[PDB]
PDB file of C-alpha atoms in Angstrom:
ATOM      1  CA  UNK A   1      13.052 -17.796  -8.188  1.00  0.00           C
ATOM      2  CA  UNK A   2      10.306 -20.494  -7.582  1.00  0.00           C
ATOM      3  CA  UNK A   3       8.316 -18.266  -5.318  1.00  0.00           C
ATOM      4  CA  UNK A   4       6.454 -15.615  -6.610  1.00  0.00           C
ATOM      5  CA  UNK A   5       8.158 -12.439  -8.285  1.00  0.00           C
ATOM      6  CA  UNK A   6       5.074 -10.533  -7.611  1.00  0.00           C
ATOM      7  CA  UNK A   7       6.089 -10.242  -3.853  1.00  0.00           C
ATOM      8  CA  UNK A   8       9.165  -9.253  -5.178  1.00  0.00           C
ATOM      9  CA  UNK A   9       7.263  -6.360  -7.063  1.00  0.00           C
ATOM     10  CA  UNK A  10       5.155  -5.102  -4.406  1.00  0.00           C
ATOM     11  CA  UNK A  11       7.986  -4.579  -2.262  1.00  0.00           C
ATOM     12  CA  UNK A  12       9.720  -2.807  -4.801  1.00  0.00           C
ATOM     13  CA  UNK A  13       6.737  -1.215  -6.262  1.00  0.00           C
ATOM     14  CA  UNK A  14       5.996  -0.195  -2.616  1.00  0.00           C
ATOM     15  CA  UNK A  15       9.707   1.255  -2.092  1.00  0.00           C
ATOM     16  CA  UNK A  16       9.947   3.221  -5.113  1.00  0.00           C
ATOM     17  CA  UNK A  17       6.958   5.293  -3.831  1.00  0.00           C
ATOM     18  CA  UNK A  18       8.844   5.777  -0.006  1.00  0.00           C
ATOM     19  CA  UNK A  19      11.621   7.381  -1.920  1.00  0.00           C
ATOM     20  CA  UNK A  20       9.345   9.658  -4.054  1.00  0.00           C
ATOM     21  CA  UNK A  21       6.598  10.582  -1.565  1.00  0.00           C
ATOM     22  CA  UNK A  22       8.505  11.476   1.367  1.00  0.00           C
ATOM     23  CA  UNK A  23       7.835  14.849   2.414  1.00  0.00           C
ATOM     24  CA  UNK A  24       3.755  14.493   1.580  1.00  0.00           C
ATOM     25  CA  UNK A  25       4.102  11.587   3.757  1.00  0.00           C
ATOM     26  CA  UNK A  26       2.245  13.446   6.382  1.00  0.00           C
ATOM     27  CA  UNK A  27      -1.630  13.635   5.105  1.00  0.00           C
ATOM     28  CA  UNK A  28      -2.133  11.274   8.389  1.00  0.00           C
ATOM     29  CA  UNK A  29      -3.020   7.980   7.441  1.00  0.00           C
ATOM     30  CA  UNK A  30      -5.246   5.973   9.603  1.00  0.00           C
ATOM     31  CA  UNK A  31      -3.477   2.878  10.766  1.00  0.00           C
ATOM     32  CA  UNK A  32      -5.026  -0.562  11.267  1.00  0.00           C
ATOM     33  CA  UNK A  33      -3.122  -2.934  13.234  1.00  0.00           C
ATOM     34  CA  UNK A  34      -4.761  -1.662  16.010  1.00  0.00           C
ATOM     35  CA  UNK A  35      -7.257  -4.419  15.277  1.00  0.00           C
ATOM     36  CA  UNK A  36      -4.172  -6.947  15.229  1.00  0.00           C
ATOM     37  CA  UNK A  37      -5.447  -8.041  18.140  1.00  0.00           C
ATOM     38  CA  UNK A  38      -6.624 -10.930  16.760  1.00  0.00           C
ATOM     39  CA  UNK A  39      -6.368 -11.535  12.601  1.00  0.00           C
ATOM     40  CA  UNK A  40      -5.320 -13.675  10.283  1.00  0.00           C
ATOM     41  CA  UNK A  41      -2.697 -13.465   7.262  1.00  0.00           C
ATOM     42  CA  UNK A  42      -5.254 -12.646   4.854  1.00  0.00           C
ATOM     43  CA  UNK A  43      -7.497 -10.314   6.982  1.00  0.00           C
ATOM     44  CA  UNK A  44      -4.213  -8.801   7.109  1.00  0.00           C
ATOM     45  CA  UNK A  45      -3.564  -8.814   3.333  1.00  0.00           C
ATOM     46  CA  UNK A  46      -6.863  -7.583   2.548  1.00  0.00           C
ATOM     47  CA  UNK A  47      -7.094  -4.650   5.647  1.00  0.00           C
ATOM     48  CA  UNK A  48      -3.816  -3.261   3.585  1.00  0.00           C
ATOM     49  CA  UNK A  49      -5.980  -3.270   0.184  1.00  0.00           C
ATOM     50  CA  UNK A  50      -8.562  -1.132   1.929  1.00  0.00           C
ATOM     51  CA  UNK A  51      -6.162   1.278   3.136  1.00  0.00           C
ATOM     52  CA  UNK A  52      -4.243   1.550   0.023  1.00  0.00           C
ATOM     53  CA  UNK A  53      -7.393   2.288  -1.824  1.00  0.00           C
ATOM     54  CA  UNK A  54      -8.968   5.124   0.791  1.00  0.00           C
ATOM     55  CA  UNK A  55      -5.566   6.358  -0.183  1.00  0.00           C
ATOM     56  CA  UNK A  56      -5.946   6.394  -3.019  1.00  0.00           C
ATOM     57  CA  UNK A  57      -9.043   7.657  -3.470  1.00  0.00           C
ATOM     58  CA  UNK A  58      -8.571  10.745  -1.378  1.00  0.00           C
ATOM     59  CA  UNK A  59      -5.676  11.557  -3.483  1.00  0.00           C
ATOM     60  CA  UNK A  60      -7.451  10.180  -6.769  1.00  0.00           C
ATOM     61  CA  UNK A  61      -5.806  11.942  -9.680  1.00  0.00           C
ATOM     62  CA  UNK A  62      -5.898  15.085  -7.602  1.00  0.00           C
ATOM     63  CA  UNK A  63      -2.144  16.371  -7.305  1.00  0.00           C
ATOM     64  CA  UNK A  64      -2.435  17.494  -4.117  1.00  0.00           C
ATOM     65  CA  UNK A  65       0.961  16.616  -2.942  1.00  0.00           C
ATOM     66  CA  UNK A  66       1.785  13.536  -4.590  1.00  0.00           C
ATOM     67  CA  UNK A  67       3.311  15.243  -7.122  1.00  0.00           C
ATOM     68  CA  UNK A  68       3.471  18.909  -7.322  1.00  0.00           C
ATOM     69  CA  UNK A  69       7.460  19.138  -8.461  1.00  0.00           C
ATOM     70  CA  UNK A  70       9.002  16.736 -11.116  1.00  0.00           C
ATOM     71  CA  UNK A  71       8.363  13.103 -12.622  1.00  0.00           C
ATOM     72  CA  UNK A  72       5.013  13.274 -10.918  1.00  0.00           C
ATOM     73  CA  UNK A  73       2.884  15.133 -12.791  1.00  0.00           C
ATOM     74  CA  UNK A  74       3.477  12.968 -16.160  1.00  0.00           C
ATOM     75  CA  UNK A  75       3.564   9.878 -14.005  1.00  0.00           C
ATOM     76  CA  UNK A  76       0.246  10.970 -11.888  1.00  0.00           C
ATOM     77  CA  UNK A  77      -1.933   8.958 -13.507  1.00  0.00           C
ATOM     78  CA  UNK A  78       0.779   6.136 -13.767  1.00  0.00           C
ATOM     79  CA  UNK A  79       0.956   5.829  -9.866  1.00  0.00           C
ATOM     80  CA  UNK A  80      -3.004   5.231  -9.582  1.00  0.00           C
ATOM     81  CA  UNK A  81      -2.637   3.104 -12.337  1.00  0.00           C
ATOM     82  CA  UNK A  82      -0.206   1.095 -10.181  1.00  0.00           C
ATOM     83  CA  UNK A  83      -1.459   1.447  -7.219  1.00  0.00           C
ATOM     84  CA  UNK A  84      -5.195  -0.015  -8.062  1.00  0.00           C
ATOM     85  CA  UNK A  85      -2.805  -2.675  -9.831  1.00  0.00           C
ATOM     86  CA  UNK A  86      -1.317  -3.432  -6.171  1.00  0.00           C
ATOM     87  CA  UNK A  87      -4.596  -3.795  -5.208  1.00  0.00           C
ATOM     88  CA  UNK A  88      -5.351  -6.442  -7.800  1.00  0.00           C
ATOM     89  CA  UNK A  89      -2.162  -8.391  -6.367  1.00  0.00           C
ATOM     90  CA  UNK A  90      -3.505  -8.144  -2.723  1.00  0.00           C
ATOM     91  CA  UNK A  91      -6.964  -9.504  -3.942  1.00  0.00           C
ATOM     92  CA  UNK A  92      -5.298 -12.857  -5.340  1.00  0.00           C
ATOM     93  CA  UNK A  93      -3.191 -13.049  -2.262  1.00  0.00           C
ATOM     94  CA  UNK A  94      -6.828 -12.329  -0.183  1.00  0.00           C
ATOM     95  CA  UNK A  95     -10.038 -13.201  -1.043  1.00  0.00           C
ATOM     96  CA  UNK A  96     -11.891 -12.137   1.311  1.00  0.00           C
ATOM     97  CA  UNK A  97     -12.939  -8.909  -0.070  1.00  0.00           C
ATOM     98  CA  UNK A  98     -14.839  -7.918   2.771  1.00  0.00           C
ATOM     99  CA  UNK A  99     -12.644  -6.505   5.722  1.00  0.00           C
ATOM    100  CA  UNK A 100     -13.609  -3.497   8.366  1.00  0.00           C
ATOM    101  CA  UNK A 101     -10.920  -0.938   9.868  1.00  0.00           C
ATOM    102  CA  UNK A 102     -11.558  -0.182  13.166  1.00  0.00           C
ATOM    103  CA  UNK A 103      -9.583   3.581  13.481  1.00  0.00           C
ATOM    104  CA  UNK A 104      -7.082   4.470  16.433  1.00  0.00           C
ATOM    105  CA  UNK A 105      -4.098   5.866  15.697  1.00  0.00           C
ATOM    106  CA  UNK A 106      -3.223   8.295  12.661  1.00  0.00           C
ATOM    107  CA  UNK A 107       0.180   7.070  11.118  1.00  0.00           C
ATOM    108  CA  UNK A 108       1.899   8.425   8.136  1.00  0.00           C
ATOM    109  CA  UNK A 109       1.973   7.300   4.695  1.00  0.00           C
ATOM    110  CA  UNK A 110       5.491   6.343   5.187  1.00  0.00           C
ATOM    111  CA  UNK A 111       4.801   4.864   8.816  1.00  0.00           C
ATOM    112  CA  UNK A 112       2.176   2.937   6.899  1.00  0.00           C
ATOM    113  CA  UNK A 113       4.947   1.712   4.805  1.00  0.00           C
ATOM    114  CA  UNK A 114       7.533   1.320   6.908  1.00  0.00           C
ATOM    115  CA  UNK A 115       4.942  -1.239   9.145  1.00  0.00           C
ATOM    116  CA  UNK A 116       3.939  -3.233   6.256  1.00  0.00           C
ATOM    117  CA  UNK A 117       6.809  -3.263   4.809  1.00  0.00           C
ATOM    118  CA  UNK A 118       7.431  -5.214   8.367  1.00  0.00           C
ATOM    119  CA  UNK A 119       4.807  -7.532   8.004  1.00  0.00           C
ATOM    120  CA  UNK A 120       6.479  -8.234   4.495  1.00  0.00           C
ATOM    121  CA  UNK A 121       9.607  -9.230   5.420  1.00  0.00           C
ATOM    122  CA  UNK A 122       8.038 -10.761   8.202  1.00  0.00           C
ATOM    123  CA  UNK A 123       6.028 -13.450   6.186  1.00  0.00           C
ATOM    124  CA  UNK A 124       8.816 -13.260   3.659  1.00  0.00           C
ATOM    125  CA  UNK A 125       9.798 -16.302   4.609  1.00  0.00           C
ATOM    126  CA  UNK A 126       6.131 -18.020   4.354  1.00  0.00           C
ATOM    127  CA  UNK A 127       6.225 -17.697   0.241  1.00  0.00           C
ATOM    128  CA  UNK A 128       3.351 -20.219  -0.529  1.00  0.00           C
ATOM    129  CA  UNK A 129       0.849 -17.863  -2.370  1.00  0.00           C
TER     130      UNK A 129
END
């Protein structure tokens, strides 16, 4: 594949997790295409990195839900460890860095999925990077 695998990864990457977390896919996430309004790819790109990470963060290495019954616990610190490395992807994809979430609308983890999944297979067929 000429394009790059690494999309190929984060949608997988990304999957894998909708299949694990589904049932602590309710902590309400706070969505962001409400200020879709008016961006561009990479504003885009980058928006998701800041969500990802508040994520994240909230959830840090705390096993709150994200785990809590089987192949979790082990893998707990694995899933940050991939997550920030998702991150890392978005940045190279991005560069700007420096990107502001207006709030509106409280999704779900997997809503948040499921929408950027969208936007993936969306601009699936714009493979440049």
């Amino acid at each position: 594949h000429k394009c790059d695998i690494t999309l190929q990864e984060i949608i997988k990457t990304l999957n894998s997790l909708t299949e694990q977390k589904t049932l602590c896919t309710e902590l309400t996430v706070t969505d962001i295409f409400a200020a879709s309004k008016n961006t561009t790819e990479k504003e885009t790109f980058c928006r998701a990195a800041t969500v990802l990470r508040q994520f994240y963060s909230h959830h840090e290495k705390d096993t709150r839900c994200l785990g809590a019954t089987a192949q979790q616990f082990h893998r707990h610190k694995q899933l940050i460890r991939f997550l920030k490395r998702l991150d890392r992807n978005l940045w190279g994809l991005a560069g700007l860095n420096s990107c502001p979430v207006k709030e509106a609308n409280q999704s779900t983890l997997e809503n948040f999925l499921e929408r950027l999944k969208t936007i993936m297979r969306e601009k699936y067929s714009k493979c440049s990077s």
